[PDB]
């Protein structure tokens, strides 16, 4: 991020602080939780809607001291009234714009928002799990403001969970009780809190929907796979990701030693001594060094992040992932709940900045061998069969004589999003009994309403609908502005939140009450379908054949002689 954008961001942070003061009313309210009373505050939106805001509700003990790297523990109850009129810290992380470490280990909180604490009927509860590659993100309203959803009669809940090495360290030694996935166990404990407490805020514990984007979509999917959460919620929405994406898990059991060494550890590679060192380290030091953890060999093997969701090496009471997610799909409780999945129309545009800095990346399209799924490729990526598979990827995406950056970004849309979605749909059809799944495609481009991901990706003036561009139509954020009621952006807010609320309510995303949806016939995907149909959201709402289908089929063709691995 440029120094100039960094200055613009600082200005926006200050402006947003004072706007949030002007949107705060003097009306506070007390609600009950199983652990004690909480005080929230009535806030306005720039559209003059209003909602009650409770932030900083603990769902677990602060994971500090001996609780670092452990599964979350239930919080201690309190007498009196806990002040929930302001947000808490985010999980320790490198700030996505300033580039310095921020946050706190004391981050296991959720926020609850609703326009009416005593409604006439119990309401759909929507639970948002943020993305950020399991290393950044937060539930702060400067990025995830509830202002658009609270126009309608729902309860919206935004959770935090531990990130990075503090959320995803994993050690083989059973005696140490650090099996991995602490951050996913945080999500489990938050969902249990929601089931047990949402009624105190007007919510229906029999009608909970979990949704998330990017790593939040992978997280939502993990919450639909694990036995830990069986029956806790009733619909799921996977926005640009899922748990079988190549980036969504990793075996990181040997990386604690590498992290300790970078932090000054002088001892031998045994889990007990490594853990003792990491338990004493300052959390900022571990998080700052995480970018250096992967070895030359792991980078060569195209591991993207050192710490993240992992297959746990031994069983514990709180175990989330006892097997690879592909195997977990075969017995998953969440295969039997209504599900919606989708992507944007140019996901890979997210990588524009990386390609401008490292233009030699386009040379990987010469043979495309590095994009062949690892389960199909030989170790050296030189086998004739591997070259043939790469040639199929190349034909799918290299449209002219010379490979281009746009070809590379189109490939990225498929390797990271569309192809894993296809593989999941086809795996899941084998392990479900007719429970519907619905596809959307977000295809609405505008620079009049944006979100901070555009700044992170250096995407000013860049046309096309990148990964995460849809979040501007779901959540208020500090770069947003009030839009005219007749504007294409305003209508897109109403449509996107309206469809999500309709799906959360009924398990069917169609409603004739959504403007532009009157003539939509949105069928879920059938096992016998050869071409997927999706609702394409542009300036209009239209059912279409997925434009990406032909390229999806070309990727699938690499498995013709290895169908057991598809």
In short:
By secondary structure, this protein is an alpha/beta fold.
Structure report:
The chain is built from 15 helices and 15 strands. Strands 1, 2, 3, 4, 7, 8, 9, 10, 11, 12, 13, 14 and 15 form a 13-stranded mixed beta sheet that branches. A two-stranded antiparallel sheet has the order 5-6. Helix content is 29%, strand content 16%. The two termini are 39 Å apart. By secondary structure, it is an alpha/beta fold. It has one domain (3-349, 415-552): Rossmann fold (3-Layer(aba) Sandwich). This is Carboxylic ester hydrolase.
Distance between the termini: 39 Å
Any idea how many domains?
Answer: 1
**Cα radius of gyration in angstroms:** 23 Å
Shape: globular
**Could you spell the SSE succession in H and E letters?**
HEEEEEEEEEHHEHEHHHHHEHHHEHHEEH
Share of helix among residues?
Answer: 25-40%
How many helices? 15
Fraction of residues in β-strands:
15-25%
CATH class: Alpha Beta
- What is the makeup of the main sheet? 13 strands, mixed
Task: Tell me the CATH topology.
Answer: Rossmann fold
CATH superfamily: Alpha/Beta hydrolase fold, catalytic domain
Q: Structural class, from helix and strand content? A: alpha/beta
CATH architecture: 3-Layer(aba) Sandwich
Protein name: Carboxylic ester hydrolase
GO molecular function, one term: carboxylic ester hydrolase activity
InterPro entries: AB_hydrolase_fold, CarbesteraseB, Carboxylesterase_B_AS
Pfam families: COesterase
């Amino acid at each position: 991020v440029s120094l100039m954008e960094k200055l613009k961001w600082k200005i926006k942070c200050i402006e947003n602080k004072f706007l949030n003061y002007r949107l705060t009313t003097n009306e506070t309210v007390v609600a009950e939780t199983e652990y004690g009373k909480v005080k929230g505050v009535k806030r306005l939106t720039v559209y003059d809607d209003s909602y009650y805001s409770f932030e900083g509700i603990p769902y677990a003990q602060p994971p500090v001291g001996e609780l670092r790297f452990k599964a979350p523990q239930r919080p201690t109850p309190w007498d009196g009234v806990r002040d929930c009129c302001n947000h808490k810290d985010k999980s320790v992380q490198v700030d996505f714009i300033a580039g310095k470490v921020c946050g706190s280990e004391d981050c296991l909180y959720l926020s609850v928002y609703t326009n009416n604490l005593n409604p006439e009927t119990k309401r759909p509860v929507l639970v948002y799990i943020h993305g950020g590659d399991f290393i950044i993100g937060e539930n702060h309203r400067d990025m995830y403001g509830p202002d658009y959803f609270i126009k309608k009669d729902v309860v919206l809940i935004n959770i935090q969970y531990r990130l990075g090495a503090l959320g995803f360290l994993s050690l083989n030694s059973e005696d140490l009780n650090v099996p991995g996935n602490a951050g996913l166990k945080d999500q489990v404990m938050a969902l249990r809190w929601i089931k047990n407490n949402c009624a105190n805020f007007g919510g229906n514990p029999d009608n909970i929907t979990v949704f998330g984007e990017s790593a939040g979509a992978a997280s939502t999917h993990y919450m639909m796979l694990t036995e830990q959460t069986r029956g806790l919620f009733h619909r799921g929405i996977l926005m640009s990701g899922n748990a079988i994406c190549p980036w969504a898990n990793t075996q990181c059991q040997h990386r604690a030693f590498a992290l300790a060494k970078l932090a000054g550890y002088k001892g031998e590679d045994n889990d007990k001594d490594v853990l003792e060192f990491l338990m004493k380290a300052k959390p900022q030091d571990l998080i700052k060094l995480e970018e250096k953890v992967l070895t030359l060999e792991e980078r060569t093997n195209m591991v993207v992040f050192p710490f993240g969701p992992t297959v746990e090496p031994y069983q514990t009471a709180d175990c989330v992932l006892p097997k690879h997610p592909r195997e977990m799909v075969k017995t998953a409780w969440g295969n039997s709940i209504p599900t919606m999945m989708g992507n944007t129309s140019y996901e890979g545009l997210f990588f524009t900045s990386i390609l401008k800095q490292m233009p030699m990346l386009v040379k990987e399209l010469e043979t495309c061998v590095n994009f062949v799924p690892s389960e199909l490729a030989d170790a050296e990526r030189t086998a004739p069969e591997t070259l043939e598979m790469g040639a199929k990827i190349k034909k799918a995406h290299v449209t002219g004589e010379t490979p281009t950056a746009d070809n590379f970004m189109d490939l990225c849309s498929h390797i990271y999003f569309w192809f894993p979605m296809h593989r999941l749909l086809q795996l899941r059809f084998n392990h479900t009994s007719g429970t519907p799944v619905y596809l959307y495609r977000f295809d609405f481009d505008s620079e009049d309403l944006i979100n901070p991901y555009r700044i992170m990706r250096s995407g000013r003036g860049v046309k096309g609908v990148s990964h995460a561009d849809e979040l501007s139509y779901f959540f208020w954020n500090q770069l947003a502005k009030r839009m005219p009621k007749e504007s294409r952006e305003y209508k897109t807010i109403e449509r996107m939140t309206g469809i999500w609320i309709q799906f959360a309510t009924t398990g069917n995303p169609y409603s004739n009450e959504i403007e532009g949806m009157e003539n939509v016939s949105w069928d879920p995907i059938k096992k016998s379908d050869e071409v997927y149909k999706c609702l394409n959201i542009s300036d209009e709402l239209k059912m279409i054949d997925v434009p990406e289908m032909d390229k999806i089929k070309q990727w699938e063709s690499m498995f013709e002689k290895h169908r057991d691995l598809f």
